[PDB]
């Protein structure tokens, strides 16, 4: 079961994002733009050097990738993914958990 060993291994593991039809998202280089019937929110990830890919097998899906290696992608993916997901919900619902 349990598994762990000190070192470094290029663990190829990318994340996939799903998007509805009532929302329009424009991808430009390293900037993610989200448009909703409740507002428009965009984010820029230039300052940060990562990997990304456009997927649309069935629906407008976004692929988030980062320096393949340690389990760092876990925290980076959760943060980046949350940002995009939060934007959609905010532009499709109104606002998010953001307090004050």
- Global shape: elongated
Q: What is the number of helices?
A: 1
Secondary structure: helix percent: 10-25%
Largest sheet: 3 strands, antiparallel
- CATH architect. name: Alpha-Beta Complex
Report the CATH C-level class. Alpha Beta
**What name goes with the CATH superfamily?**
Ribosomal protein L6
CATH topology: Outer Surface Protein A, domain 3
Tally of structural domains: 1
What Rg, in angstroms, do the CA atoms define? 15 Å
Along the chain, the helix and strand elements come as EEEEEEH
- Summing up helix and strand content along with how strands pair, one would put the structural category as alpha+beta
Total beta-strand segments: 6
From the N-terminal CA to the C-terminal CA, the straight-line distance is 44 Å
- What is the spatial order of strands in the main beta sheet? 1-6-5
Protein name: Large ribosomal subunit protein uL6
Subunit structure: Component of the large ribosomal subunit.
Subcellular location: Cytoplasm
Family: Belongs to the universal ribosomal protein uL6 family.
Describe, in plain words, how this protein is organized in 3D.
The protein is an alpha+beta fold and 100 residues long. The protein has a single domain (13-100), classed as Ribosomal protein L6 (Outer Surface Protein A, domain 3). Helix content is 21%, strand content 30%. The protein has 1 helix and 6 strands. The strands form 2 sheets. It has a 3-stranded antiparallel sheet, with helices on one face. The chain is elongated. The relative contact order is 0.25. Component of the large ribosomal subunit. The ribosome is a large ribonucleoprotein complex responsible for the synthesis of proteins in the cell.
């Amino acid at each position: 079961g349990s598994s762990g060993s000190s070192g470094m291994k290029t663990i190829l593991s990318n994340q996939t994002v799903d998007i509805p039809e009532n929302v329009d998202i424009t991808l430009k280089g390293r900037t993610v733009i989200v448009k909703g019937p409740r507002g428009t929110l965009r984010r820029d990830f230039n300052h940060i050097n990562v990997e990304l890919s456009l997927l649309g097998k069935k629906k407008k899906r976004l692929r988030v990738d980062k320096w393949w290696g340690n389990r760092k992608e876990l925290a980076t993916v959760r943060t980046i993914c949350s940002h995009v997901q939060n934007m959609i919900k905010g532009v499709t619902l109104g606002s998010g958990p953001s307090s004050g």
